[PDB]
Amino acid sequence: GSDLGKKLLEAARAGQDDEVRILMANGADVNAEDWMGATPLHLAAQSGHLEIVEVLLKTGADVNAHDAFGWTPLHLAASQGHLEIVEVLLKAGADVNATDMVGRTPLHLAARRGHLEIVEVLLKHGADVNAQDKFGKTPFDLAIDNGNEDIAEVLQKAAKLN
């Protein structure tokens, strides 16, 4: 047939690591893209499938691929709260300050979604506390706007150390 990439995307999304292996062993492209521009690495990162993320990174997946929204796998993991995946992606060379279609970095998304440990990991890897999205908002602003007081404090303190 020829639905290899399509099936690999589905297997990565569903966390079916055995199917991921089978499809890759049969020639499926690890950098296949779905209708939204998401790759297997995007889909595994979104759904929290750590081990599939790790194996894709070992087998040629592009850590900095962006989808139609401008989201990278790191945006997705940071937004969804998958701390270990965030760490693995950063270790593999993910751009900590990549911006999506509205100018938001992974730190914006983690701050908005209230993921404190991810905020701290992103800061450790050089995330930009002063980054403004297309609406002029910093991650601190998005933390305030979403009632994430503890994250806002962490961000306000980090801005003093620049």
Numbering used by the authors: 1 to 162
What did the published study say regarding this structure?
Here, we report the selection of designed ankyrin repeat proteins (DARPins) recognizing mTFP1 (monomeric teal fluorescent protein 1). Here, we report the selection of DARPins recognizing mTFP1, one of the brightest and most photostable FPs in the blue-green spectrum. We characterized these binders both biochemically and biophysically and determined the three-dimensional structure of one DARPin-mTFP1 complex. The two DARPins we report here bind specifically and with high affinity to mTFP1.
The complex with DARPin 1238_G01 did not crystallize, but the structure of both isolated DARPins was determined as well (1238_G01, 1.6 Å resolution, R/Rfree of 16/18) and (1238_E11, 2.1 Å resolution, R/Rfree of 17/21). Of these analysed clones, only two candidates, named 1238_E11 and 1238_G01, showed a specific binding to mTFP1 while the majority of previous hits seemed to also be interacting with free streptavidin. For DARPins 1238_E11, a high affinity with an equilibrium dissociation constant (KD) value of 3 nM was determined, while the affinity of 1238_G01 was found to be lower with a value of ∼88 nM. Anti-mTFP1 DARPin 1238_E11 and DARPin 1238_G01 differ in 13 out of 21 selected library residues, suggesting alternative binding epitopes, in line with the ELISA experiments. Despite having different binding affinities, both DARPins, 1238_E11 and 1238_G01, bind in a very similar way inside the cell, suggesting that both affinities are sufficiently high.
